[PDB]
Enzyme design. Structure first.
Site, mmCIF file in Angstrom:
data_model
loop_
_atom_site.group_PDB
_atom_site.id
_atom_site.type_symbol
_atom_site.label_atom_id
_atom_site.label_comp_id
_atom_site.label_asym_id
_atom_site.label_seq_id
_atom_site.Cartn_x
_atom_site.Cartn_y
_atom_site.Cartn_z
ATOM 1 N N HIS A 198 18.907 -117.927 -71.895
ATOM 2 C CA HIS A 198 19.633 -116.742 -71.150
ATOM 3 C C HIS A 198 20.659 -117.569 -70.161
ATOM 4 O O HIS A 198 20.523 -118.945 -70.217
ATOM 5 C CB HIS A 198 18.545 -116.242 -70.182
ATOM 6 N N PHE B 57 9.871 -119.525 -71.289
ATOM 7 C CA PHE B 57 10.769 -118.325 -71.294
ATOM 8 C C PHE B 57 12.071 -118.603 -72.174
ATOM 9 O O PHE B 57 12.422 -119.659 -72.378
ATOM 10 C CB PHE B 57 11.438 -118.405 -69.655
ATOM 11 N N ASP C 200 21.845 -117.226 -66.412
ATOM 12 C CA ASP C 200 21.359 -116.901 -65.188
ATOM 13 C C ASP C 200 22.354 -115.639 -64.409
ATOM 14 O O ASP C 200 23.452 -115.691 -64.503
ATOM 15 C CB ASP C 200 21.468 -117.943 -63.838
ATOM 16 N N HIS D 272 20.246 -121.867 -71.008
ATOM 17 C CA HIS D 272 19.387 -122.777 -71.057
ATOM 18 C C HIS D 272 17.845 -121.914 -71.205
ATOM 19 O O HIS D 272 17.632 -120.754 -71.259
ATOM 20 C CB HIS D 272 19.133 -123.107 -69.551
HETATM 21 C C1 LIG Z 1 15.149 -120.680 -62.428
HETATM 22 C C2 LIG Z 1 13.826 -121.256 -62.958
HETATM 23 C C3 LIG Z 1 13.619 -121.780 -63.932
HETATM 24 C C4 LIG Z 1 12.437 -120.035 -63.114
HETATM 25 O O1 LIG Z 1 13.345 -119.120 -64.083
HETATM 26 C C5 LIG Z 1 13.400 -117.943 -63.142
HETATM 27 O O2 LIG Z 1 13.171 -117.596 -62.202
HETATM 28 C C6 LIG Z 1 14.171 -116.714 -64.468
HETATM 29 N N1 LIG Z 1 14.737 -115.840 -63.532
HETATM 30 C C7 LIG Z 1 14.439 -114.245 -63.314
HETATM 31 O O3 LIG Z 1 13.524 -114.125 -63.961
HETATM 32 C C8 LIG Z 1 15.218 -113.807 -62.425
HETATM 33 C C9 LIG Z 1 14.430 -113.519 -61.206
HETATM 34 C C10 LIG Z 1 15.041 -112.684 -60.144
HETATM 35 C C11 LIG Z 1 14.045 -112.156 -58.846
HETATM 36 N N2 LIG Z 1 12.995 -111.181 -59.197
HETATM 37 C C12 LIG Z 1 15.267 -111.363 -58.155
HETATM 38 O O4 LIG Z 1 14.843 -109.989 -57.891
HETATM 39 O O5 LIG Z 1 16.288 -111.626 -57.367
HETATM 40 C C13 LIG Z 1 15.010 -117.475 -64.913
HETATM 41 O O6 LIG Z 1 14.558 -118.272 -65.948
HETATM 42 S S1 LIG Z 1 16.727 -117.579 -64.412
HETATM 43 C C14 LIG Z 1 11.110 -120.701 -64.030
HETATM 44 O O7 LIG Z 1 10.888 -119.675 -64.810
HETATM 45 O O8 LIG Z 1 10.733 -121.644 -63.861
HETATM 46 FE FE LIG Z 2 17.620 -119.514 -65.607
#
Ligand SMILES: CC(C)[C@@H](OC(=O)[C@@H](NC(=O)CCC[C@H](N)C(=O)O)C(=O)S)C(=O)O
Ligand SMILES: [Fe+2]
Length: 329
Positions: A212, A209, A214, A268
Protein backbone atom coordinates in the site's frame (compact mmCIF):
# COMPACT_ATOMS: atom_id res chain seq x y z
CA UNK A 1 17.84 -13.35 -1.19
CA UNK A 2 16.31 -9.98 -0.23
CA UNK A 3 18.60 -6.93 -0.47
CA UNK A 4 18.66 -4.35 2.33
CA UNK A 5 16.98 -1.04 1.48
CA UNK A 6 18.99 2.18 1.70
CA UNK A 7 17.46 3.92 4.70
CA UNK A 8 19.80 6.65 5.88
CA UNK A 9 19.95 7.87 9.47
CA UNK A 10 19.47 11.66 9.45
CA UNK A 11 20.24 13.81 12.49
CA UNK A 12 17.17 16.06 12.55
CA UNK A 13 18.27 18.08 15.59
CA UNK A 14 19.08 21.25 13.58
CA UNK A 15 15.38 21.46 12.57
CA UNK A 16 14.49 22.40 16.15
CA UNK A 17 16.90 25.35 16.15
CA UNK A 18 17.80 28.55 14.33
CA UNK A 19 20.93 27.64 12.35
CA UNK A 20 19.50 28.13 8.85
CA UNK A 21 22.49 26.70 6.95
CA UNK A 22 22.47 23.60 9.19
CA UNK A 23 18.76 23.20 8.46
CA UNK A 24 19.44 23.35 4.72
CA UNK A 25 21.98 20.52 5.04
CA UNK A 26 19.33 18.41 6.81
CA UNK A 27 16.81 19.35 4.11
CA UNK A 28 19.20 18.05 1.43
CA UNK A 29 19.41 14.69 3.20
CA UNK A 30 15.60 14.54 3.35
CA UNK A 31 15.47 15.42 -0.36
CA UNK A 32 17.92 12.64 -1.22
CA UNK A 33 16.10 10.00 0.84
CA UNK A 34 12.71 11.07 -0.55
CA UNK A 35 14.01 10.77 -4.12
CA UNK A 36 15.64 7.36 -3.41
CA UNK A 37 13.79 4.65 -1.43
CA UNK A 38 11.41 7.11 0.23
CA UNK A 39 12.43 6.13 3.76
CA UNK A 40 14.83 7.48 6.36
CA UNK A 41 15.38 7.18 10.09
CA UNK A 42 15.15 10.45 12.03
CA UNK A 43 17.75 10.32 14.82
CA UNK A 44 18.51 12.81 17.62
CA UNK A 45 14.77 13.52 17.68
CA UNK A 46 14.53 14.17 21.40
CA UNK A 47 11.64 11.80 22.21
CA UNK A 48 11.94 9.19 24.97
CA UNK A 49 10.98 6.14 22.92
CA UNK A 50 11.98 3.60 25.59
CA UNK A 51 9.42 5.17 27.95
CA UNK A 52 6.84 5.28 25.13
CA UNK A 53 7.40 1.54 24.60
CA UNK A 54 7.18 0.76 28.30
CA UNK A 55 3.94 2.69 28.81
CA UNK A 56 2.44 1.13 25.66
CA UNK A 57 3.46 -2.38 26.82
CA UNK A 58 1.83 -1.80 30.21
CA UNK A 59 -1.41 -0.87 28.43
CA UNK A 60 -1.50 -3.73 25.90
CA UNK A 61 -0.73 -6.43 28.45
CA UNK A 62 -3.28 -5.25 31.04
CA UNK A 63 -6.31 -4.35 28.94
CA UNK A 64 -9.02 -7.00 29.25
CA UNK A 65 -11.55 -8.39 26.78
CA UNK A 66 -14.32 -6.50 28.63
CA UNK A 67 -12.49 -3.19 28.17
CA UNK A 68 -11.84 -3.91 24.48
CA UNK A 69 -15.58 -4.25 23.76
CA UNK A 70 -16.28 -1.13 25.82
CA UNK A 71 -13.75 0.86 23.79
CA UNK A 72 -14.33 -0.81 20.40
CA UNK A 73 -14.77 1.02 17.11
CA UNK A 74 -17.99 0.58 15.11
CA UNK A 75 -16.56 -2.24 12.97
CA UNK A 76 -16.52 -4.43 16.09
CA UNK A 77 -19.31 -2.89 18.19
CA UNK A 78 -22.51 -1.63 16.56
CA UNK A 79 -23.42 0.35 19.70
CA UNK A 80 -20.55 2.77 18.95
CA UNK A 81 -21.67 4.45 15.73
CA UNK A 82 -19.62 7.62 16.40
CA UNK A 83 -16.37 5.62 16.64
CA UNK A 84 -15.05 5.18 13.13
CA UNK A 85 -11.38 6.04 13.76
CA UNK A 86 -10.80 6.30 17.50
CA UNK A 87 -10.94 3.36 19.92
CA UNK A 88 -10.01 -0.32 20.12
CA UNK A 89 -9.52 -2.53 17.04
CA UNK A 90 -9.91 -6.12 18.28
CA UNK A 91 -8.02 -9.22 17.29
CA UNK A 92 -10.00 -12.35 16.31
CA UNK A 93 -8.23 -15.40 17.75
CA UNK A 94 -7.70 -18.02 15.07
CA UNK A 95 -8.28 -15.44 12.29
CA UNK A 96 -6.77 -12.01 12.89
CA UNK A 97 -3.70 -11.55 15.06
CA UNK A 98 -3.13 -7.81 15.22
CA UNK A 99 -4.99 -5.53 17.63
CA UNK A 100 -4.60 -1.82 18.32
CA UNK A 101 -5.82 1.35 19.96
CA UNK A 102 -6.16 4.58 17.96
CA UNK A 103 -6.55 8.12 19.28
CA UNK A 104 -6.85 11.53 17.65
CA UNK A 105 -6.14 15.13 18.62
CA UNK A 106 -6.80 15.60 22.36
CA UNK A 107 -8.29 19.04 21.52
CA UNK A 108 -11.24 17.31 19.82
CA UNK A 109 -13.46 17.73 22.89
CA UNK A 110 -17.27 17.77 22.99
CA UNK A 111 -17.25 21.59 22.61
CA UNK A 112 -14.84 21.70 19.63
CA UNK A 113 -16.52 23.35 16.64
CA UNK A 114 -15.85 20.39 14.34
CA UNK A 115 -17.25 17.93 16.89
CA UNK A 116 -20.34 20.11 17.29
CA UNK A 117 -20.78 20.21 13.49
CA UNK A 118 -20.25 16.42 13.32
CA UNK A 119 -17.68 16.86 10.56
CA UNK A 120 -16.39 13.55 9.20
CA UNK A 121 -13.01 12.31 10.47
CA UNK A 122 -13.24 14.26 13.76
CA UNK A 123 -14.11 12.26 16.90
CA UNK A 124 -13.74 12.62 20.66
CA UNK A 125 -11.21 10.09 21.96
CA UNK A 126 -12.33 7.19 24.10
CA UNK A 127 -10.13 6.04 27.04
CA UNK A 128 -10.07 3.11 29.45
CA UNK A 129 -10.90 3.64 33.13
CA UNK A 130 -8.23 5.67 34.95
CA UNK A 131 -8.16 3.37 38.02
CA UNK A 132 -7.53 0.34 35.78
CA UNK A 133 -4.86 2.11 33.68
CA UNK A 134 -3.32 4.76 35.93
CA UNK A 135 -1.53 7.52 34.06
CA UNK A 136 -2.21 6.05 30.61
CA UNK A 137 -4.48 8.76 29.18
CA UNK A 138 -2.14 11.50 30.46
CA UNK A 139 0.90 9.77 29.04
CA UNK A 140 -0.77 9.14 25.68
CA UNK A 141 -1.99 12.74 25.34
CA UNK A 142 1.50 14.06 26.17
CA UNK A 143 2.97 11.63 23.61
CA UNK A 144 0.65 13.08 20.97
CA UNK A 145 2.16 16.52 21.63
CA UNK A 146 5.74 15.23 21.77
CA UNK A 147 5.39 13.51 18.37
CA UNK A 148 3.46 16.52 17.00
CA UNK A 149 6.51 18.66 17.85
CA UNK A 150 8.88 16.25 16.11
CA UNK A 151 6.55 16.15 13.10
CA UNK A 152 6.44 19.95 12.88
CA UNK A 153 10.25 20.04 12.80
CA UNK A 154 10.31 17.32 10.10
CA UNK A 155 7.77 19.32 8.07
CA UNK A 156 10.14 22.32 8.19
CA UNK A 157 12.84 20.05 6.69
CA UNK A 158 10.52 18.78 3.91
CA UNK A 159 9.47 22.35 3.04
CA UNK A 160 13.09 23.53 2.78
CA UNK A 161 13.91 20.38 0.76
CA UNK A 162 11.27 21.34 -1.84
CA UNK A 163 12.57 24.91 -2.20
CA UNK A 164 9.86 26.49 -0.03
CA UNK A 165 9.91 28.59 3.16
CA UNK A 166 10.10 26.41 6.28
CA UNK A 167 6.47 26.95 7.35
CA UNK A 168 5.02 25.79 4.00
CA UNK A 169 3.51 22.60 5.43
CA UNK A 170 3.74 23.43 9.14
CA UNK A 171 1.35 26.42 8.86
CA UNK A 172 -1.46 23.90 8.08
CA UNK A 173 -0.41 21.55 10.94
CA UNK A 174 -1.88 23.12 14.07
CA UNK A 175 -2.79 21.87 17.55
CA UNK A 176 -6.38 23.13 17.35
CA UNK A 177 -7.39 21.21 14.24
CA UNK A 178 -4.91 18.58 13.05
CA UNK A 179 -6.46 15.32 11.92
CA UNK A 180 -3.27 13.45 12.92
CA UNK A 181 -3.64 10.10 14.68
CA UNK A 182 -1.56 7.86 16.92
CA UNK A 183 -2.05 4.07 16.66
CA UNK A 184 -0.72 1.76 19.40
CA UNK A 185 -0.43 -1.54 17.55
CA UNK A 186 0.21 -4.90 19.16
CA UNK A 187 1.55 -7.76 17.01
CA UNK A 188 1.44 -10.92 19.11
CA UNK A 189 3.58 -14.00 19.42
CA UNK A 190 1.25 -16.99 18.86
CA UNK A 191 1.92 -20.74 19.11
CA UNK A 192 0.40 -22.07 16.76
CA UNK A 193 0.08 -18.94 14.59
CA UNK A 194 -3.19 -19.01 12.65
CA UNK A 195 -2.67 -19.43 8.92
CA UNK A 196 -5.85 -17.38 8.39
CA UNK A 197 -3.98 -14.42 9.95
CA UNK A 198 -1.10 -14.74 7.47
CA UNK A 199 -1.39 -13.30 3.94
CA UNK A 200 0.81 -14.41 1.04
CA UNK A 201 2.31 -11.95 -1.46
CA UNK A 202 2.59 -12.75 -5.17
CA UNK A 203 6.33 -13.38 -4.64
CA UNK A 204 5.56 -15.88 -1.86
CA UNK A 205 6.48 -13.64 1.07
CA UNK A 206 4.34 -14.22 4.18
CA UNK A 207 2.75 -10.94 5.28
CA UNK A 208 0.72 -9.36 8.04
CA UNK A 209 -0.37 -6.41 5.83
CA UNK A 210 -0.29 -6.09 2.04
CA UNK A 211 1.33 -3.53 -0.22
CA UNK A 212 0.00 0.00 0.00
CA UNK A 213 0.83 3.70 -0.03
CA UNK A 214 0.17 5.60 3.20
CA UNK A 215 -2.81 7.86 3.76
CA UNK A 216 -0.89 10.79 5.22
CA UNK A 217 1.26 13.80 4.45
CA UNK A 218 4.14 12.01 6.17
CA UNK A 219 4.26 9.02 8.54
CA UNK A 220 6.39 9.13 11.72
CA UNK A 221 6.83 5.62 13.12
CA UNK A 222 8.36 4.01 16.16
CA UNK A 223 8.69 0.21 16.11
CA UNK A 224 10.32 -2.45 18.26
CA UNK A 225 13.66 -3.89 17.12
CA UNK A 226 12.19 -6.73 15.04
CA UNK A 227 12.70 -6.40 11.29
CA UNK A 228 9.42 -6.46 9.38
CA UNK A 229 8.92 -3.71 6.80
CA UNK A 230 9.71 -3.96 3.09
CA UNK A 231 9.77 -1.23 0.45
CA UNK A 232 9.26 -1.72 -3.29
CA UNK A 233 12.12 -0.33 -5.33
CA UNK A 234 13.25 -0.78 -8.95
CA UNK A 235 15.29 -3.78 -7.79
CA UNK A 236 12.28 -5.37 -6.06
CA UNK A 237 11.03 -5.45 -2.48
CA UNK A 238 13.89 -4.65 -0.09
CA UNK A 239 14.07 -5.08 3.70
CA UNK A 240 13.97 -1.96 5.87
CA UNK A 241 16.30 -2.50 8.84
CA UNK A 242 14.77 -2.07 12.30
CA UNK A 243 16.07 0.75 14.52
CA UNK A 244 14.27 1.07 17.87
CA UNK A 245 16.14 4.26 18.75
CA UNK A 246 14.95 6.27 15.75
CA UNK A 247 11.71 7.16 14.02
CA UNK A 248 11.13 5.71 10.53
CA UNK A 249 9.80 8.44 8.25
CA UNK A 250 8.14 8.20 4.84
CA UNK A 251 5.81 10.27 2.69
CA UNK A 252 2.12 9.51 2.21
CA UNK A 253 0.07 10.04 -0.95
CA UNK A 254 -0.90 13.63 -0.07
CA UNK A 255 2.81 14.57 -0.38
CA UNK A 256 2.96 12.70 -3.70
CA UNK A 257 -0.06 14.68 -4.92
CA UNK A 258 1.30 18.09 -3.86
CA UNK A 259 4.74 17.47 -5.37
CA UNK A 260 3.44 15.82 -8.58
CA UNK A 261 5.17 12.59 -7.59
CA UNK A 262 8.61 14.27 -7.13
CA UNK A 263 8.43 12.85 -3.61
CA UNK A 264 6.61 9.57 -4.19
CA UNK A 265 4.59 7.77 -1.50
CA UNK A 266 6.67 4.59 -1.35
CA UNK A 267 4.83 1.32 -1.76
CA UNK A 268 5.56 -0.87 1.25
CA UNK A 269 4.27 -3.90 3.12
CA UNK A 270 4.55 -5.63 6.50
CA UNK A 271 6.10 -9.08 6.66
CA UNK A 272 4.62 -11.74 8.91
CA UNK A 273 6.94 -12.30 11.89
CA UNK A 274 5.98 -14.56 14.80
CA UNK A 275 7.09 -12.20 17.54
CA UNK A 276 5.55 -10.09 20.29
CA UNK A 277 6.22 -6.54 19.08
CA UNK A 278 4.93 -3.01 18.89
CA UNK A 279 4.28 -0.66 16.00
CA UNK A 280 3.40 2.93 16.94
CA UNK A 281 2.74 5.16 13.94
CA UNK A 282 1.80 8.85 14.02
CA UNK A 283 0.03 9.76 10.77
CA UNK A 284 0.75 13.43 10.03
CA UNK A 285 -2.54 14.78 8.72
CA UNK A 286 -3.38 18.46 8.21
CA UNK A 287 -6.69 20.20 9.03
CA UNK A 288 -10.03 19.37 7.38
CA UNK A 289 -10.05 22.45 5.15
CA UNK A 290 -6.30 22.57 4.52
CA UNK A 291 -5.57 22.96 0.83
CA UNK A 292 -2.04 23.22 -0.48
CA UNK A 293 -1.77 24.13 -4.19
CA UNK A 294 0.04 21.38 -6.06
CA UNK A 295 3.42 22.18 -7.60
CA UNK A 296 6.33 20.47 -9.38
CA UNK A 297 9.96 21.05 -8.32
CA UNK A 298 11.18 19.40 -11.54
CA UNK A 299 9.62 22.12 -13.73
CA UNK A 300 11.09 25.59 -14.26
CA UNK A 301 7.84 27.44 -13.51
CA UNK A 302 6.94 24.92 -10.79
CA UNK A 303 3.44 24.42 -12.23
CA UNK A 304 1.52 21.18 -11.97
CA UNK A 305 -1.45 19.77 -13.89
CA UNK A 306 -3.05 18.47 -10.68
CA UNK A 307 -6.16 19.92 -9.01
CA UNK A 308 -6.09 21.20 -5.43
CA UNK A 309 -7.49 18.68 -2.97
CA UNK A 310 -8.62 19.54 0.56
CA UNK A 311 -7.02 17.39 3.24
CA UNK A 312 -10.42 16.43 4.69
CA UNK A 313 -11.62 15.10 1.32
CA UNK A 314 -8.33 13.25 0.85
CA UNK A 315 -8.37 11.66 4.31
CA UNK A 316 -11.96 10.37 4.54
CA UNK A 317 -11.75 8.88 1.05
CA UNK A 318 -8.30 7.41 1.70
CA UNK A 319 -9.09 5.64 4.99
CA UNK A 320 -12.10 3.91 3.46
CA UNK A 321 -10.14 2.89 0.36
CA UNK A 322 -7.32 1.38 2.41
CA UNK A 323 -9.81 -0.70 4.45
CA UNK A 324 -11.42 -1.90 1.21
CA UNK A 325 -8.07 -2.86 -0.33
CA UNK A 326 -6.19 -4.36 2.61
CA UNK A 327 -8.95 -5.15 5.11
CA UNK A 328 -10.29 -3.82 8.40
CA UNK A 329 -7.44 -3.67 10.93
C1 LIG B 1 2.52 2.16 9.94
C2 LIG B 1 2.70 0.79 10.60
C3 LIG B 1 3.49 -0.15 9.69
C4 LIG B 1 1.50 -0.13 10.89
O1 LIG B 1 0.53 0.02 9.81
C5 LIG B 1 -0.48 0.88 9.84
O2 LIG B 1 -0.81 1.49 10.87
C6 LIG B 1 -1.39 0.81 8.62
N1 LIG B 1 -2.24 2.00 8.68
C7 LIG B 1 -3.57 1.98 8.62
O3 LIG B 1 -4.20 0.92 8.81
C8 LIG B 1 -4.25 3.34 8.70
C9 LIG B 1 -4.71 3.55 10.16
C10 LIG B 1 -5.39 4.94 10.26
C11 LIG B 1 -5.89 5.10 11.72
N2 LIG B 1 -7.09 4.29 12.06
C12 LIG B 1 -6.61 6.43 11.64
O4 LIG B 1 -7.99 6.82 11.73
O5 LIG B 1 -5.95 7.69 11.39
C13 LIG B 1 -0.36 0.81 7.56
O6 LIG B 1 0.18 -0.22 7.24
S1 LIG B 1 0.11 2.42 6.96
C14 LIG B 1 1.68 -1.62 11.21
O7 LIG B 1 0.85 -2.44 10.76
O8 LIG B 1 2.65 -1.91 11.94
FE1 LIG C 1 2.15 2.07 5.73
Amino acid sequence: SVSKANVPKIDVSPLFGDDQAAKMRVAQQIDAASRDTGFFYAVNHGINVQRLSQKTKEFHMSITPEEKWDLAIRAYNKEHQDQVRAGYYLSIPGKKAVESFCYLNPNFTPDHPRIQAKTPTHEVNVWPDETKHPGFQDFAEQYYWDVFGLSSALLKGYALALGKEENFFARHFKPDDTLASVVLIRYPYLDPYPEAAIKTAADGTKLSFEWHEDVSLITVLYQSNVQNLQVETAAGYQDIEADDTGYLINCGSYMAHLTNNYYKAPIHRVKWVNAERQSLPFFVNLGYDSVIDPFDPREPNGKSDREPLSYGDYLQNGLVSLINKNGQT
